[model samples]
Target: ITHMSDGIIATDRRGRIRIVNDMALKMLGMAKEDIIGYYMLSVLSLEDEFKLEEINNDSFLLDLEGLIARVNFSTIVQETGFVTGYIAVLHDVTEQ
Candidate 1:
């Protein structure tokens, strides 16, 4: 699940969105109804020009003009030693 300070995103192994926290929703200006069950790439591609490969490699920090956002992604391995899916957390660095 996504956190408050960090925009956490959880998805299935196939990249289907499972859980998105409040910060993610607000930062992306999206509602749960519009995101849940959708592919994370689809949503991300619509908002920004970032690639999935880039998001998975390392922490991402971007300054989109006046908007600044930091993101990090990681996989969630189940207790059965299987990768269930991935999680992405983004934090807005813009001054509030």
Candidate 2:
């Protein structure tokens, strides 16, 4: 899954970024060195979206500068059932 087109991002509890996939780097136009250790707000601004008039809590979107993308966010559960981090999958949707 390393070469997957969908961008994958992982973050820590403090909201500091940990890992980002190759696809996300291309789509965000950012280098891995520039994204790591940064807050989610600084890296990207994905907005909430809805399905059938109800908000889908895990789904997010990027609709800016003509680059539209879809994202799915999930918490990283720990052994104790605590949320230690989160993972977000990003996919560009500008063509469709």
Candidate 3:
């Protein structure tokens, strides 16, 4: 929460936000209260869901609820071959 280099937004299996770090809150220009009950689907959208070790080479330039940002995904694998949730790390990058 204090020293993470990248902003992390973790969601539950249903895409509900379980925990949101301060960095992530700031990165998205949002307050914790503003996002607690909301799913990130408002800011970001992915295709086919996420997988364990699912790393895409192509960077995502998202609208991010009116804030321009770049993003990457890494799935939260509970057990081998079992994806429980996902982690989205985002930053300021060109939507250009």
lDDT leader: 1
Residue pairs with colliding backbones in model 1 are 2-8
Residues 1-96 of candidate 2: C-alpha lDDT, one tens digit per residue? 122578888888766789987888887888899999987645676323222122136556664353767777677778997778777678777533
How are the candidates ranked when ordered by TM-score, highest leading?
A: 2, 1, 3
- Model 3 alpha-carbon drift over 4 Å, by segment: 1-3, 45-55, 64-67, 94-96
lDDT of each: 0.72, 0.68, 0.65
- Candidate 1: residue 16 lDDT (0-100): 84
List the lowest-lDDT window of 10 residues for candidate 3: 46-55
Q: Which of 1 and 2 is ahead in TM-score?
A: 2
Give the local distance difference test score of model 1.
0.72
Cα error of candidate 3 at position 73, Å: 1.1
TM-score of 1: 0.72
Report the error of model 1 at residue 50, Å.
7.5
Candidate 1 vs 2: which has more lDDT: 1
lDDT of 1 at 81: 80
Question: Which residue runs does candidate 2 get wrong by more than 4 Å?
Answer: 1-3, 46-58, 64-66, 94-96
